[PDB]
Design a protein around this ligand. Sequence first.
Ligand SMILES: [Mg+2]
Ligand SMILES: [Mg+2]
Ligand SMILES: [Mg+2]
Ligand SMILES: [Mg+2]
Ligand SMILES: [Mg+2]
Ligand SMILES: [Mg+2]
Ligand SMILES: [Mg+2]
Ligand SMILES: [Mg+2]
Ligand SMILES: [Mg+2]
Ligand SMILES: [Mg+2]
Ligand SMILES: [Mg+2]
Ligand SMILES: [Mg+2]
Ligand SMILES: [Mg+2]
Ligand SMILES: [Mg+2]
Ligand SMILES: [Mg+2]
Ligand SMILES: [Mg+2]
Ligand SMILES: [Mg+2]
Ligand SMILES: [Mg+2]
Ligand SMILES: [Mg+2]
Ligand SMILES: [Mg+2]
Ligand SMILES: [Mg+2]
Ligand SMILES: [Mg+2]
Ligand SMILES: [Mg+2]
Ligand SMILES: [Mg+2]
Ligand SMILES: [Mg+2]
Ligand SMILES: [Mg+2]
Ligand SMILES: [Mg+2]
Ligand SMILES: [Mg+2]
Ligand SMILES: [Mg+2]
Ligand SMILES: [Mg+2]
Ligand SMILES: [Mg+2]
Ligand SMILES: [Mg+2]
Ligand SMILES: [Mg+2]
Ligand SMILES: [Mg+2]
Ligand SMILES: [Mg+2]
Ligand SMILES: [Mg+2]
Lengths: 80, 86, 79, 122, 207
Amino acid sequence: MVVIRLARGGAKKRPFYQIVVTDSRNARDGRFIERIGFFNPTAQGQAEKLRLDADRFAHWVSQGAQPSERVASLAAQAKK
Amino acid sequence: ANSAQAKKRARQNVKARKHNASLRSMVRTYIKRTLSAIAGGDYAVATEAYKKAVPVIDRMADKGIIHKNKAARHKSRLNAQVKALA
Amino acid sequence: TVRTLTGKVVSDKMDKSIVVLIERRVQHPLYGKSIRRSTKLHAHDENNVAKIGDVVTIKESRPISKTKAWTLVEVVEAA
Amino acid sequence: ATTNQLIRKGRTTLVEKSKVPALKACPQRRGVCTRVYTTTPKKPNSAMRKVCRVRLTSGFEVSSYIGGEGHNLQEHSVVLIRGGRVKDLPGVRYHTVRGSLDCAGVKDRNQSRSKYGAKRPK
Amino acid sequence: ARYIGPKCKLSRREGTDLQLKSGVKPFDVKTKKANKAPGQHGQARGGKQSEYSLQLREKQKVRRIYGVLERQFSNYYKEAARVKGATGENLLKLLESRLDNVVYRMGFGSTRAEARQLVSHRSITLNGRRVNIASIQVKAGDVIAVHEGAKQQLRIKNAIELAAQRGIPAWIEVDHSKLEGTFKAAPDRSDLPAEINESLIVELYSK
RNA sequence: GCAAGACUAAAACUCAAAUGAAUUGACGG
RNA sequence: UAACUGAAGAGUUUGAUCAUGGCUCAGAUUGAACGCUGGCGGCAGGCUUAACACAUGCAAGUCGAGCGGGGGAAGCGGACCUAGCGGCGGACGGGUGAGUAAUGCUUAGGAAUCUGCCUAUUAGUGGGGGACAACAUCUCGAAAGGGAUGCUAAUACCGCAUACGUCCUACGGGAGAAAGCAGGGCCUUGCGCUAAUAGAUGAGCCUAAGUCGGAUUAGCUAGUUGGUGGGGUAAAGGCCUACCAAGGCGACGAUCUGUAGCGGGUCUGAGAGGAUGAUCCGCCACACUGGGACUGAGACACGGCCCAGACUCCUACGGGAGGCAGCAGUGGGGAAUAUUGGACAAUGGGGGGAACCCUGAUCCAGCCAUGCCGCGUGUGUGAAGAAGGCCUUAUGGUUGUAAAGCACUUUAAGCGAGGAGGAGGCUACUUUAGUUAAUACCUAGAGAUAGUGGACGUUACUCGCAGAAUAAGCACCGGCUAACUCUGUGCCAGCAGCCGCGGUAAUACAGAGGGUGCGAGCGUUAAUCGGAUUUACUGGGCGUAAAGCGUGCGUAGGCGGCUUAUUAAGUCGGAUGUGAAAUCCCCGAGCUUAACUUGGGAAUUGCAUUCGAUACUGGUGAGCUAG
Ligand SMILES: [Mg+2]
Ligand SMILES: [Mg+2]
Ligand SMILES: [Mg+2]
Ligand SMILES: [Mg+2]
Ligand SMILES: [Mg+2]
Ligand SMILES: [Mg+2]
Ligand SMILES: [Mg+2]
Ligand SMILES: [Mg+2]
Ligand SMILES: [Mg+2]
Ligand SMILES: [Mg+2]
Ligand SMILES: [Mg+2]
Ligand SMILES: [Mg+2]
Ligand SMILES: [Mg+2]
Ligand SMILES: [Mg+2]
Ligand SMILES: [Mg+2]
Ligand SMILES: [Mg+2]
Ligand SMILES: [Mg+2]
Ligand SMILES: [Mg+2]
Ligand SMILES: [Mg+2]
Ligand SMILES: [Mg+2]
Ligand SMILES: [Mg+2]
Ligand SMILES: [Mg+2]
Ligand SMILES: [Mg+2]
Ligand SMILES: [Mg+2]
Ligand SMILES: [Mg+2]
Ligand SMILES: [Mg+2]
Ligand SMILES: [Mg+2]
Ligand SMILES: [Mg+2]
Ligand SMILES: [Mg+2]
Ligand SMILES: [Mg+2]
Ligand SMILES: [Mg+2]
Ligand SMILES: [Mg+2]
Ligand SMILES: [Mg+2]
Ligand SMILES: [Mg+2]
Ligand SMILES: [Mg+2]
Ligand SMILES: [Mg+2]
């Protein structure tokens, strides 16, 4: 199954997620089809908190990708 | 096997293996009847053996015992071999 | 849309199959001089047309045999 | 020389050889010493050089040098040896590490104490 | 770590004053052993050269009048070699934009070590935060104030006296009433003492 | 290769030099 | 707007000289180890050796909304729980690098293929039957495991019926499925099941080109090379077979043989190169050793099966059990490498309608100066230049503003108070939109009102209290190479990277005083590149220093006069694909700064396709006459 999920690579105690479209059998931080945005849960100051390529998201949810719970609520934060 | 599910999977493997073996042997037996009739040379005997063997092959391909491409290949080759008989 | 090569028939003794020599000019990486390299391709001619010494043109197909995946298109120079 | 000559036959590298073959690319090596004796140096030098004859865990059997003034090695002592050859003793290509397993540190030392396994005096 | 030891020693070795011991009447005639390198036989030594001793003593001079150690200094050099201009003046501007040096220059703290205990003890404010890293690179425009609970100690107000008749350069616009900063853009190789021949340092780091 | 041998052709080990051309002396049956 | 900026030499052959030429040294680097010393923090990293053997715990389950039985708490029963059977999962994630020199890998292309779960789209889900576990009864055995007799349900199994499309057709015809469950009022929703299609994903197959040595390895191959009939595959194919033909591969290195997982990358270097393939990502291979298959959408399956083996263990002697190269841990080996920790709070993964359960993945914590980066160990003044040490010409010099002394400060550590953020959500409360007899039920969407929900965790951070209080060593000092004296010693003891020092004034040994260099580190050993233009493509040589074959002739090969037409292979230019992310580089963004994390570019100099240009090289035609 193709999913859209968070790949955690940041620093210790300071996560930074890449929103990736991948096959769900791959490792969390391994091989993916396409990176579409990022999520920075802390994001102080002038840093971006959440960037989410919307046309790619729509294209992949059209091809049958299934977002996570987190990426669903984040795609709700965007476009809004 | 270490966990309970691994030994249940081994049990189910034994049962499925017996079932599948019966069905696969059946398909081979019907193809052999068709081929023995073909080697016999008669066209009526060959066509009746082929008419009996086609539904068994299609049935066992519907159940996944053999692949559908295998079924199509047998149905095509046995047919070409009974049409050459007469 | 296809991938074609050109060469010379160096053998034809095999049943409806030729051996063609494609010549290539590969540049040496360190010393920067183009040196001539060669490759022999077992190609397929079903009519037994090409004879040893012809200049022919081949194109990649699906495998016809073990080590034969090229098929003849035509003879350019019937030598 | 010519370009064609270089493409045909390339340029050959002469791979070097290790000067410490008995260490087997290890930094140090544990040996058991079978012979503690003295040697005399080469042409212009004069001394009674304290040398050890160790069998290494790497299978070799080599002579190492005991540095510093005064040691306590015997036969069947377990020593650590390292690289570094002594110039006037031909064939001694290793040193014994002082302050290691059985080799104690040098006594009464106060300068370059790290190189002789001597602890800071208090 | 930082160097904690006799300071006039460093000027006697480096020949020049080095600006340590920010003193009332130091005038480099407070040690009286000046013009005489330290030690048992530093006396009968005026010095000629080695051309490596020259590069090395230039580098130690620049390092000791800023309180930097050798690892941090070589990192400064590797950064200044990366910026687009000339390496030596880039390096001098890096050493100039340090916080303890900017504090010394604006007037708080008499020495660069007093201006370093000022910074390390959080008695300084950089854009509002109570920093305590003396190696922070102040950038053009940054505001450097004294902390509220640390602006009535006589150590800073009586260093503001030595701040005048000595300093407060062009690239720093400081008011000694509010005890405030606004360090503007970095200096260039015209605002700093010119006896520092930083080409020696650039050639030392290419050995 | 009849043989004498030729040809192809290493490594361990060892030393901190070996070498060319010229200089000034000294020596030369 | 940047994406670049780049290159040092010394010593040593001689009485001296220039050259040649080796050796050695100064730099950077490390999964290092060892010696002496050791305050803290932040980030990383941590069996490189025995793919040696493994005690103990844990690493893969879940679903009662598929199905019978059961069992019991609270009240004859309803809620709950679950050994079985049946779904799905267990083919992922995790480990390792033994094998592998090409069925691997990288780059660029292809057919002849399958593909559970997911997304659309169609056509359906009609009706029967016989079983088997559980269960009951007995029985074998020490156990493990089994047996027998009956009884059973099902979304388990098998017929029959009916097929939009599907398959086979000789084109007329023939053939082939399925399963129910749940929630609300037989109807509707869902969740399933069947048959197809095309999308995604994922995998299989094929081609070309590259991928370490060795010729003191030159011949190799007989299903071998090709064809045909047949068989076999999901799929092309000697994949297999019978017959026929004889081939095929090799000095552009076949076959054999030693070594080796491969790439993105990493280190070094001015580059070109050279070394390398820890940690992170991709691919491959492997699971105690050798075979084999089963079941599945997928395995020839790490914690599945069968059979052989060694080895360990239990045994009532008949028989049985096992596989840490999962995470911890042990023994061993080794110079050398950590806790038998916590939580599923987050990100994922499996199951489930959900609730939830599982998860040694992961997130965290422990240990270790192993590395990088940061901070600290106080700051001012202070001359009688104290005392003491050391040298001394015995007056002095030096340690040295150093110390005392006086005045301040409180980072970090200690002790107290607060204290984010990592938590998006879910549950209740009202509505809107749908679907539909229906405002039910279920999906989605809002709004405020409270409940919850953090392993880390005494979190970061902030603010107070105290008191200079809790916190410096290591190497070196003849030259190279920064920094010198005394005393002891006497070719000894010793030092030593090279040159070399030491035979009674040793700046070279040992100690001291002084000094230089680094600094919570500093040295040594080991290793790679460098300097080394010391394999020279960039960028060397061969009269005498090493180096022209004894001399010809010629094969492969390399290179070839002049003019012209043409072509467009090399060559050049553009465009279009591709060249994973990470890393490197440049701008800039967040951590108090820095390491570190991160946005966007640049780069990836390659290859492919396509279009253009023809000076030069090549091909082809035609000429010419200086070779
Ligand atoms: Mg189960
Ligand atoms: Mg093949
Ligand atoms: Mg159960
Ligand atoms: Mg391997
Ligand atoms: Mg069924
Ligand atoms: Mg039927
Ligand atoms: Mg039915
Ligand atoms: Mg064929
Ligand atoms: Mg055949
Ligand atoms: Mg065939
Ligand atoms: Mg070969
Ligand atoms: Mg190997
Ligand atoms: Mg170079
Ligand atoms: Mg399955
Ligand atoms: Mg199967
Ligand atoms: Mg398994
Ligand atoms: Mg295991
Ligand atoms: Mg383990
Ligand atoms: Mg041991
Ligand atoms: Mg979890
Ligand atoms: Mg504190
Ligand atoms: Mg919270
Ligand atoms: Mg010197
Ligand atoms: Mg010494
Ligand atoms: Mg003496
Ligand atoms: Mg000494
Ligand atoms: Mg440090
Ligand atoms: Mg080189
Ligand atoms: Mg030369
Ligand atoms: Mg010669
Ligand atoms: Mg000659
Ligand atoms: Mg020729
Ligand atoms: Mg030619
Ligand atoms: Mg072209
Ligand atoms: Mg990239
Ligand atoms: Mg001509």
